[PDB]
A paper describes a structure:
At one level this relies on proper links of the actin network to cadherin receptor-mediated cell-cell adherens junctions, to integrin receptor-directed focal adhesions, and to intercalated discs that are required for muscle cell function and that orchestrate coordinated movement. These links are provided in part by [name], a highly conserved and structurally dynamic protein that stabilizes adhesions complexes and which binds to actin through the agency of its five-helix bundle tail (Vt) domain. [name] is always co-expressed with [name] in muscle but, unlike [name], it cannot homodimerize and rather forms heterodimers with [name], an interaction thought important for [name] functions. Importantly, although its insert does not bind to actin, [name] differs markedly from [name] in its control of the actin network, where the [name] tail (MVt) domain (a surrogate for activated [name]) induces a fine meshwork of actin filaments while Vt provokes the formation of tight actin bundles.
To define the molecular underpinnings of [name]'s unique functions we solved the crystal structures of full-length human [name] (124 kDa) and its tail domain to 3.4 Å and 2.2 Å resolution, respectively. Thus, the true helical bundle MVt domain (residues 959–1,134) lacks the H1 α-helix of [name]. However, a comparison of the tail domain structures of [name] with that of [name] demonstrated that α-helix H1′ has several additional interactions with the four-helix bundle H2–H5 compared to α-helix H1. Specifically, there are two additional hydrophobic and hydrogen bond interactions in [name], and there is also an electrostatic interaction of Arg-1107 with Glu-976 present in α-helix H1′, whereas the corresponding residues in Vt do not interact.
Author numbering: 961 to 1116, 1123 to 1129
The structure:
Amino acid sequence: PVNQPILAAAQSLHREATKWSSKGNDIIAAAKRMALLMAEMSRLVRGGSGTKRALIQCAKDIAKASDEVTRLAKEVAKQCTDKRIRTNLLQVCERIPTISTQLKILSTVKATMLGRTNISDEESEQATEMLVHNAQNLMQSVKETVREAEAASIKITLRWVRK
């Protein structure tokens, strides 16, 4: 069914995001959608063909959800009194648009490769491993962004309720 390391990265973010309720928290909601979509991604990279259009669109959905995470976490940071946390939170959540832009590039590469041209099992495996590493980086960054966004809120209209 799956590419295990992508699914594991997805579950890793799911575990952090499900510490809290989505109610009145769109960072939490977006992060949960990201983890669910990234699990779908691991199915798609490990299915196919037929999965070409789906691979591209799934990455687009993930990138859209990550813009919401980024946008909100930047607002949290810029209300945070602790410079140490504020700076760290700005540092991480400003990696995210680049990583999720990279997710869209590498998914399209994996999906479409060289168009009509024939491709080896080596190029195919290499393209998988590029995608894998980028997915782990993304899941890591958002998980760190969730943790720090909550840490920063202690120093401050966003709701953190433990489940």
